[PDB]
C-alpha cells in the first residue's frame, strides 16, 4: 500500500530538451538481432512490472 | 508500504538538457546480437520489478 | 516501510548538461555480441529489483 | 524501515554538466562479447536490489 | 533501520563537471570479453545490493 | 562590382536552433527609452547601407 | 571590386544552436537609456556600411 | 580589389552551440544609461565600414 | 589588394562550445554609464573598419 | 597586399570550450562608468582598423 498526504511528487518527468542533429549521411544495415537508435526524450514509469527503454536483444530460444 | 506526509520529493527527473550532434557520415553494421545508440534524456521509474535502459544482449538458447 | 514527513527528497536526477560531440566519421561493425554507445542524461531509480543502464552482455547459454 | 523527518536528501545527483567531444574518426569493430562506450551524465538509485551502470561481461553458459 | 531528523544529506551526487576530449582518431577493436569506454560523471546510490559502475569481466563458465 | 562565377556562397544563414525558454513570471516595465527583448534567429544582409539588429537607443534631440 | 572563381564561401553564418534557459522570475524595470536582453542566433553581412547587433545608447544629445 | 581562386574560406562563423542558463531570479534595473545582457551565438561580417556586437554607451552630447 | 589561390581560410570561427550557467539569484543595478554581461560564443570579421565586441563606455561629451 | 597560394590558414579561432559556472548570487550595481562581466569564447579579425574586446572606459571630455 502507498499513502500521498498533502504531498507534491514527481516521478520519471522531462522538463525541457533542446536537440540538434545534423548528419550527412547516416546508414543502418541490419541481418538478424536487433538495432535501436536515437531514443530521445523518453519518460516512463512502471508499477509492479519490469520496464525497459531502448532495450535490444538478439534472438531467443 | 510507503508514505508521504507534506513532503516534495524529485524520483527519475531530467531538466533541462542542451545536445548538439554532428556527424559527416555515421554507418552501423550489425549481424546478430544487438546495437544501441544515442539513447539520450531518459527518465524512469520501476517499483518491484526489473528496469533497464540502453540494455543490450546477445543471443540466448 | 518509507515515511517521508515534511521532507524534500531527490533521487536520480539530472538538473543541467550542455553536451557538444562533432565526428566527421564514426562506424560501428559488430558481428553477434552486443554493443552501446551514447547513452546521456538518464536518470532512473528502481524499488525492490534490479536495474541496469547501459549494459551490455555477449550470448548467454 | 526508513523516516525521514524535515529532512532535505540528495542521493544520485548530477546538477551541471559541460561535455564537448571532437572525433575525426572513430569505429568500433566487435566480434561477439561486449562494448560501451560513451555512458555519460548517468544518475541511478536503486532500493533493495544489484545496480549496474555500463556494465559488460562476456559470454555466459 | 535509518532515521533523519532535521538533517542535510548529500550521497552520491557530482555537481560540475567540464570536459573536452579531442580525438583524431579512436578504435576499439574486440574479439570476445568485454571493454567499457569513456564512462564519465556518474553518480549512484544502491541500498541492500552490489552496484557496478564500468565493471567489465570476461567470458563466464 | 561584383562578380561570381561557378562559385557557391553563404552570407548571413542561419541552419539549425532548437531553443526552449520556461518562465513561470516575466514583467518587463517601462518609461521612456527602449527595450529589446528575445530576438532570436535572425539573419540579414544588407548592401550599401547600415544594417542594425536588436538596437536601442535612447531619446535623441 | 571583388571575384569569386571556383570558390566556396561562408560568411556571417550559424549552423547549430541548441539552448535551454529556465528562469523562476525575470523582471526589466527601464526608466530612459535602453536595454538589450536576450538576443540569440543572429548573423548579419554589412557591405559598405556599419553594423551593429544588439547594440545599446543612452540619449543623444 | 579582393580574389578567390579554387579557395575555400569561412568568416564569421559558429558551427555548434550548446547553452543552458538556469536561473531561480534575474533582474535588470536601469536609469538611464545603457544595458546589454545575454547576446549568445552571434556571428557578423562587415566590409568597409564599422561593426560593433553587444556594445553599450552612456548617453552622448 | 587581397588573393587566396587553392587556399582554404578560417577567420573568426567558433567550432563547439558547451556551457552551463546556474545561478540563484542575479541583480543588474544601473545609473547612468554602461553594462555589458554574458556575451558569449560570438564570432566577427571587420575590414577597413574599426570593430569591438563587449564594449562599454560611460557617457561622452 | 597580401596573396596565399596553396596555404590552409587559421586566425582568430576557437575550436572546442566546456565552462560551467555556478553562483548562489551575483550583483553589479553600477552608478556612471562601465562594467563589462563573462565575455566567453570570442574570436575576431579585424583588417585595417582598430579592434577591441571586453573593453571598458569610463566617461569621456
Given at each position: 500500500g502507498v499513502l500521498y498526504v498533502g504531498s507534491k511528487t514527481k516521478e520519471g518527468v522531462v522538463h525541457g530538451v533542446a536537440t540538434v542533429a545534423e548528419k550527412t549521411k547516416e546508414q543502418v544495415t541490419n541481418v538478424g538481432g536487433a538495432?535501436?537508435?536515437?531514443?530521445?526524450?523518453?519518460?516512463?514509469?512502471?508499477?509492479?512490472?519490469?520496464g525497459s527503454i531502448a532495450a535490444a536483444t538478439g534472438f531467443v530460444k
Open positions: 538495432v535501436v537508435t536515437g531514443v530521445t526524450a523518453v519518460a516512463q514509469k512502471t508499477v509492479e512490472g519490469a
